[PDB]
Motif scaffolding. Structure first.
Motif, PDB file in Angstrom:
ATOM      1  N   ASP A 118       4.172   0.354  -4.245  1.00  0.00           N
ATOM      2  CA  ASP A 118       3.301   1.431  -4.321  1.00  0.00           C
ATOM      3  C   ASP A 118       2.031   1.096  -4.559  1.00  0.00           C
ATOM      4  O   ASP A 118       1.153   1.466  -3.941  1.00  0.00           O
ATOM      5  CB  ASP A 118       3.894   2.503  -5.196  1.00  0.00           C
ATOM      6  CG  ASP A 118       5.107   3.271  -4.762  1.00  0.00           C
ATOM      7  OD1 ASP A 118       5.727   2.947  -3.803  1.00  0.00           O
ATOM      8  OD2 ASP A 118       5.408   4.041  -5.785  1.00  0.00           O
ATOM      9  N   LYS A 119       1.607   0.342  -5.565  1.00  0.00           N
ATOM     10  CA  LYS A 119       0.336   0.035  -5.964  1.00  0.00           C
ATOM     11  C   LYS A 119      -0.507  -0.232  -4.768  1.00  0.00           C
ATOM     12  O   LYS A 119      -1.601  -0.013  -4.699  1.00  0.00           O
ATOM     13  CB  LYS A 119       0.221  -0.997  -7.254  1.00  0.00           C
ATOM     14  CG  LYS A 119      -1.099  -1.228  -7.869  1.00  0.00           C
ATOM     15  CD  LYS A 119      -0.856  -2.189  -8.820  1.00  0.00           C
ATOM     16  CE  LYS A 119      -2.602  -2.555  -9.384  1.00  0.00           C
ATOM     17  NZ  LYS A 119      -2.260  -3.433 -10.577  1.00  0.00           N
ATOM     18  N   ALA A 120      -0.080  -1.370  -4.444  1.00  0.00           N
ATOM     19  CA  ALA A 120      -0.696  -2.194  -3.040  1.00  0.00           C
ATOM     20  C   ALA A 120      -0.883  -1.184  -1.911  1.00  0.00           C
ATOM     21  O   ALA A 120      -1.924  -0.714  -1.410  1.00  0.00           O
ATOM     22  CB  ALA A 120      -0.020  -3.227  -2.735  1.00  0.00           C
ATOM     23  N   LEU A 121      -0.022  -0.393  -1.399  1.00  0.00           N
ATOM     24  CA  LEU A 121       0.014   0.645  -0.697  1.00  0.00           C
ATOM     25  C   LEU A 121      -0.943   1.643  -0.863  1.00  0.00           C
ATOM     26  O   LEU A 121      -1.739   1.945  -0.006  1.00  0.00           O
ATOM     27  CB  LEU A 121       1.294   1.105  -0.139  1.00  0.00           C
ATOM     28  CG  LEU A 121       2.362   0.030   0.574  1.00  0.00           C
ATOM     29  CD1 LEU A 121       3.731   0.851   0.693  1.00  0.00           C
ATOM     30  CD2 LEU A 121       1.720  -0.271   1.913  1.00  0.00           C
ATOM     31  N   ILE A 122      -0.647   2.358  -1.991  1.00  0.00           N
ATOM     32  CA  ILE A 122      -1.751   3.403  -2.418  1.00  0.00           C
ATOM     33  C   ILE A 122      -3.183   2.909  -2.410  1.00  0.00           C
ATOM     34  O   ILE A 122      -4.053   3.734  -1.905  1.00  0.00           O
ATOM     35  CB  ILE A 122      -1.245   4.053  -3.713  1.00  0.00           C
ATOM     36  CG1 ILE A 122       0.089   4.585  -3.587  1.00  0.00           C
ATOM     37  CG2 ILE A 122      -2.184   4.941  -4.222  1.00  0.00           C
ATOM     38  CD1 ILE A 122       0.650   4.962  -4.835  1.00  0.00           C
ATOM     39  N   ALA A 123      -3.437   1.776  -2.840  1.00  0.00           N
ATOM     40  CA  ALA A 123      -4.915   1.291  -2.975  1.00  0.00           C
ATOM     41  C   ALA A 123      -5.311   1.315  -1.278  1.00  0.00           C
ATOM     42  O   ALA A 123      -6.594   1.662  -1.170  1.00  0.00           O
ATOM     43  CB  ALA A 123      -4.912  -0.261  -3.494  1.00  0.00           C
ATOM     44  N   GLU A 124      -4.589   1.007  -0.578  1.00  0.00           N
ATOM     45  CA  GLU A 124      -4.856   0.984   0.918  1.00  0.00           C
ATOM     46  C   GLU A 124      -5.085   2.599   1.615  1.00  0.00           C
ATOM     47  O   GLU A 124      -5.987   2.925   2.273  1.00  0.00           O
ATOM     48  CB  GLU A 124      -4.123   0.027   1.818  1.00  0.00           C
ATOM     49  CG  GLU A 124      -4.229  -1.330   1.475  1.00  0.00           C
ATOM     50  CD  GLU A 124      -5.630  -1.955   1.682  1.00  0.00           C
ATOM     51  OE1 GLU A 124      -6.387  -1.611   2.789  1.00  0.00           O
ATOM     52  OE2 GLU A 124      -6.309  -2.520   0.940  1.00  0.00           O
ATOM     53  N   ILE A 125      -4.166   3.377   1.083  1.00  0.00           N
ATOM     54  CA  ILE A 125      -4.071   4.650   1.401  1.00  0.00           C
ATOM     55  C   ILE A 125      -5.347   5.549   0.983  1.00  0.00           C
ATOM     56  O   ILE A 125      -5.625   6.192   2.017  1.00  0.00           O
ATOM     57  CB  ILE A 125      -2.846   5.396   0.822  1.00  0.00           C
ATOM     58  CG1 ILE A 125      -1.457   4.986   1.465  1.00  0.00           C
ATOM     59  CG2 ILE A 125      -3.196   6.756   1.089  1.00  0.00           C
ATOM     60  CD1 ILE A 125      -0.341   5.259   0.872  1.00  0.00           C
ATOM     61  N   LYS A 126      -5.804   5.232  -0.150  1.00  0.00           N
ATOM     62  CA  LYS A 126      -7.076   5.846  -0.669  1.00  0.00           C
ATOM     63  C   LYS A 126      -8.227   5.703   0.423  1.00  0.00           C
ATOM     64  O   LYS A 126      -9.534   6.527   0.287  1.00  0.00           O
ATOM     65  CB  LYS A 126      -7.352   5.292  -2.072  1.00  0.00           C
ATOM     66  CG  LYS A 126      -6.161   5.853  -3.140  1.00  0.00           C
ATOM     67  CD  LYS A 126      -6.843   5.177  -4.397  1.00  0.00           C
ATOM     68  CE  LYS A 126      -6.109   5.835  -5.532  1.00  0.00           C
ATOM     69  NZ  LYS A 126      -6.319   5.050  -6.925  1.00  0.00           N
TER      70      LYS A 126
END
Length: 175
Positions: free
Chosen positions: A141-149
């Motif tokens: 989640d951490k990695a994906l969310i960073a990109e989602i932002k």
């Protein structure tokens, strides 16, 4: 007496099967199924959810995650013919899902006895997610969310569910 015995009897031996010329081959995916692609789930309890495609696994299924923190969908397997590949993408360059595989997502061989007991007293079932699995979800989640932002409406997009409306024509609609 009651019935005349047969003059001969059929053999009880079972003939061996012939060599079957059906060698296994790798699963070919659709051109749109590229890691990072946001998928619409068409089946299961997460039907209507939007997930990020992370990795094709050995059993011909796809590894996906909401992210969980984004819309409740945990890291899990999904059969590819039940997903819609949209044009929206989340970069997975910083997402390490190499540790996940079919064995990782394998279920415990619950016995018939135990199944009966569960059916008799389902209220006694106390499932719990392995600490490892919880932490694994946090990392993904951490990695994906960073990109989602990077896209102001993407998290919201993923949070929102999918449903057809009156007048929609799926054979004309594009994703």
């Amino acid at each position: 007496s009651a019935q005349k015995a047969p003059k001969w009897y059929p053999s009880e031996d079972v003939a061996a099967l012939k060599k079957t010329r059906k060698a296994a081959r790798p699963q070919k995916l659709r051109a749109s199924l590229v890691p990072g692609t946001v998928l619409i789930l068409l089946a299961g309890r997460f039907r209507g959810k939007r997930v990020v495609y992370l990795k094709h696994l050995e059993d011909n299924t796809l590894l996906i995650s909401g992210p969980f923190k984004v819309n409740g969908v945990p890291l899990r397997r999904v059969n590819a013919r039940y997903v819609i590949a949209t044009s929206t993408k989340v970069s997975v360059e910083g997402v390490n899902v190499e540790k996940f595989n079919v064995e990782y997502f394998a279920k415990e061989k619950l016995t018939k006895k135990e199944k009966k007991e569960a059916n008799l007293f389902p209220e006694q079932q106390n499932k719990e997610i392995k600490a490892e699995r919880v932490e694994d979800q946090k990392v993904v989640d951490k990695a994906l969310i960073a990109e989602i932002k990077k896209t102001p409406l993407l998290k919201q997009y993923l949070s929102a569910s999918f449903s057809l409306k009156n007048g929609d024509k799926p054979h004309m609609l594009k994703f």
